[PDB]
Design an enzyme around this catalytic site. Structure first.
Site, PDB file in Angstrom:
ATOM      1  N   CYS A  64      29.656  11.204  33.688  1.00  0.00           N
ATOM      2  CA  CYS A  64      30.480  11.358  35.157  1.00  0.00           C
ATOM      3  C   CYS A  64      29.147  11.899  35.952  1.00  0.00           C
ATOM      4  O   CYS A  64      28.898  11.408  37.165  1.00  0.00           O
ATOM      5  CB  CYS A  64      31.468  12.519  34.835  1.00  0.00           C
ATOM      6  SG  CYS A  64      32.303  12.958  33.000  1.00  0.00           S
ATOM      7  N   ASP A 255      34.959  15.511  36.481  1.00  0.00           N
ATOM      8  CA  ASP A 255      34.390  14.290  37.321  1.00  0.00           C
ATOM      9  C   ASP A 255      33.339  14.937  38.438  1.00  0.00           C
ATOM     10  O   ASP A 255      33.569  15.610  39.166  1.00  0.00           O
ATOM     11  CB  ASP A 255      35.042  13.261  37.490  1.00  0.00           C
ATOM     12  CG  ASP A 255      34.789  11.861  37.740  1.00  0.00           C
ATOM     13  OD1 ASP A 255      35.700  11.006  38.314  1.00  0.00           O
ATOM     14  OD2 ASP A 255      33.932  11.669  37.321  1.00  0.00           O
ATOM     15  N   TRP A 272      31.920   5.780  46.120  1.00  0.00           N
ATOM     16  CA  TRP A 272      31.379   6.910  45.183  1.00  0.00           C
ATOM     17  C   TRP A 272      31.202   6.620  43.847  1.00  0.00           C
ATOM     18  O   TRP A 272      31.940   6.109  42.803  1.00  0.00           O
ATOM     19  CB  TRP A 272      32.758   7.890  45.236  1.00  0.00           C
ATOM     20  CG  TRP A 272      33.102   8.465  46.548  1.00  0.00           C
ATOM     21  CD1 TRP A 272      33.380   7.572  47.580  1.00  0.00           C
ATOM     22  CD2 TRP A 272      32.863   9.786  46.991  1.00  0.00           C
ATOM     23  NE1 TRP A 272      33.503   8.461  48.737  1.00  0.00           N
ATOM     24  CE2 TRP A 272      32.876   9.625  48.429  1.00  0.00           C
ATOM     25  CE3 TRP A 272      32.337  10.851  46.588  1.00  0.00           C
ATOM     26  CZ2 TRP A 272      33.030  10.838  49.202  1.00  0.00           C
ATOM     27  CZ3 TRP A 272      32.139  12.081  47.106  1.00  0.00           C
ATOM     28  CH2 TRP A 272      32.407  12.134  48.361  1.00  0.00           C
ATOM     29  N   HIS A 274      30.131   6.825  39.911  1.00  0.00           N
ATOM     30  CA  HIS A 274      30.180   7.875  38.914  1.00  0.00           C
ATOM     31  C   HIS A 274      30.089   7.019  37.303  1.00  0.00           C
ATOM     32  O   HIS A 274      30.885   6.284  37.194  1.00  0.00           O
ATOM     33  CB  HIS A 274      31.156   8.873  39.126  1.00  0.00           C
ATOM     34  CG  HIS A 274      32.631   8.187  39.191  1.00  0.00           C
ATOM     35  ND1 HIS A 274      33.643   8.599  38.583  1.00  0.00           N
ATOM     36  CD2 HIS A 274      32.922   7.289  40.023  1.00  0.00           C
ATOM     37  CE1 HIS A 274      34.839   8.101  38.917  1.00  0.00           C
ATOM     38  NE2 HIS A 274      34.255   7.014  39.890  1.00  0.00           N
TER      39      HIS A 274
END
EC number: 2.3.2.13
Length: 331
Positions: A64, A255, A272, A274
């Site tokens: 993450c 996360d 975003w 991750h």
């Protein structure tokens, strides 16, 4: 130890990544492939591309978190973090609204606090703040010129942040980023910097002394933002997961999603990035894959998570990890 974390081996900086394309707002590829992509597009120091270090690769591999760490250069402190919460929704649900078949008070309360949060609003908040902080450093060749500049814009917008303490998380933020201080990047010159955002998702009941209920249903008073500023105090984050409801329910501790510094006026289409989890290719978990998800995807998601923080830090302006646009995919 199959579920031992491994660090990805070095990609050549010559080789491209393979084709991927978003599905319903997300895209994804194995860490190896992501490293390739990273080296092609995010890797520059001074316009000149380069390999992911061993060390950088090792960080990446924690999951993450690992792309925020690489991209920011440091493990996330989260000291300067914003969010949006509707204090009025909360108190009028809280005492004019009504629980749902079989839901207890703690349950009910934790839940209504979770939904009184607004993420789109917390994101634009840290983004409008980042903009101010950034215009405050544009021309400012020492920290003074910066802070002065800062203070003026703040005062001019009649912003609650103006009144923040001067050892506050907000004001300290730039003298406290390690790269600021560097010969290499920054050099005690504000103008040599850029504001960056990432986000953390996380759980509200984290207390050893917590009543069981909080640990499992949520702490309605934990990590509330300050209503003038929006700031949230992250000191109470000890990275503790959610406690189980049934035995079916296993929970991650948090996360993290990297936004960086896109110019994209439509928050919804911003990306975003991750990883899914640490790298265990030998193992059950599997290899890390990394997702470039749209904002509307990032702010949904999990169950695991009853709070969201939008955090600011700074990186040197010579680096390319927080470019004006990021794309989903490969190409």
């Amino acid at each position: 130890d199959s579920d031992d974390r491994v660090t990805p081996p070095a990609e050549p900086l010559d080789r491209m990544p393979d084709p991927y394309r978003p599905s319903y707002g997300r895209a994804e590829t194995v860490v190896n492939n992501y490293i390739r992509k990273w080296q092609q597009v995010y890797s520059h120091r001074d316009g000149r591309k380069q390999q992911m270090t061993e060390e950088q690769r090792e960080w990446l591999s924690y999951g993450c978190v690992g792309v925020t760490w690489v991209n920011s250069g440091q493990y996330p402190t989260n000291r300067l973090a914003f969010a949006s919460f509707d204090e009025d929704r909360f108190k009028n649900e809280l005492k004019n609204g009504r629980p749902r078949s079989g839901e207890t008070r703690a349950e009910f309360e934790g839940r209504v606090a979770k939904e009184s949060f607004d993420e789109e609003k917390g994101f634009q908040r840290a983004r409008e703040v980042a903009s101010v902080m950034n215009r405050a450093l544009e021309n400012a060749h020492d920290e003074s010129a910066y802070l002065d500049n800062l203070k003026k814009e703040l005062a001019n917008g009649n912003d609650a942040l103006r009144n923040e303490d001067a050892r506050s998380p907000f004001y300290s933020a730039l003298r406290n980023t390690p790269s600021f201080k560097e010969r290499n990047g920054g050099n005690h010159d504000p103008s040599r910097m850029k504001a960056v955002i990432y986000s953390k998702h996380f759980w509200s009941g984290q207390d050893r002394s917590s009543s069981a209920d909080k640990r499992k249903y949520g702490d309605p008073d934990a990590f509330r933002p300050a209503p003038g500023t929006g700031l949230v105090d992250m000191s109470r984050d000890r990275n503790i997961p959610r406690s189980p409801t049934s035995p079916g329910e296993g929970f991650v501790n948090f996360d993290y999603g990297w936004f960086g510094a896109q110019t994209e006026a439509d928050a919804d289409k911003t990306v975003w990035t991750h990883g899914n989890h640490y790298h265990a290719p030998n193992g059950s978990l599997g290899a890390m894959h990394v997702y470039e998800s749209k904002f509307r995807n990032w702010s949904e998601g999990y169950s695991d998570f009853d709070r969201g923080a939008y955090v600011i830090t700074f990186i040197p302006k010579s680096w390319n990890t927080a470019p004006d646009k990021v794309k989903q995919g490969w190409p």
